Amino acid sequence: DGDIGLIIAVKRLAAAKTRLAPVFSAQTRENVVLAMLVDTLTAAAGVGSLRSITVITPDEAAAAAAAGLGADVLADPTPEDDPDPLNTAITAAERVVAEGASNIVVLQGDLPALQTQELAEAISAARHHRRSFVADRLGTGTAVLCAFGTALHPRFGPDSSARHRRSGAVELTGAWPGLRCDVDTPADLTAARQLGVGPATARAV
């Protein structure tokens, strides 16, 4: 059995992926965000090195979906006026997950084209470092952050790749297109769909 505690943080679905609003009705946009989480979780759950998957979210629909796939779920109590709610949530989940795992991996929940093998390989590569990350497709963001026997020090948000790099996290290379293809914009979604999205995202779009 595995040694990696995987964390995914998910914001309120109404707030999520607002740059997809031009191509989706609000209910369809929320459905796409949830479906991308489902496909990401499904791909991740195939990775043999995982001990657990923990989803932290204030969104009860996302909570139900994750729990319904056999993930651990943490309610996110982070106030609305917290200046950095994403990293606050990750750090909160980390404190819990750290009780049961020494090696923790934070994964974006909007990777609908993720293949199990891609994540497995990324984690194998990460084992050679204390802290490491995979940049997303366009290079400014972070698809995955990995910490082996040390604190994550997450710097997700704008310009996270650069911030992670500055923090001393080593950048992993490895094509892993499905791992890198996070979906923020319609262009990102087009790219993901060309790689091949999982069935939940296929249905939602």
Numbering used by the authors: 7 to 211
List passages from the publication reporting this PDB structure.
To understand the molecular basis of PEP recognition by Mtb-FbiD, we crystallized the protein and solved the structure by selenium single-wavelength anomalous diffraction (Se-SAD), and then used this selenomethionine-substituted structure to obtain the native FbiD structure by molecular replacement. The latter was then refined at 1.99 Å resolution (R/Rfree = 0.19/0.22). As expected, Mtb-FbiD adopts the same MobA-like nucleoside triphosphate transferase family protein fold as CofC: a central 7-stranded β-sheet (six parallel strands and one antiparallel), with α-helices packed on either side. FbiD has a cone-shaped binding cleft with a groove running across the base of the cone, formed by the C-terminal end of the central β-sheet. Moreover, we did not observe GTP binding in either our co-crystallization or differential scanning fluorimetry experiments. We speculate that the GTP binding site is not formed until FbiD/CofC interacts with FbiA/CofD, enabling catalysis to proceed through to formation of dehydro-F420-0.
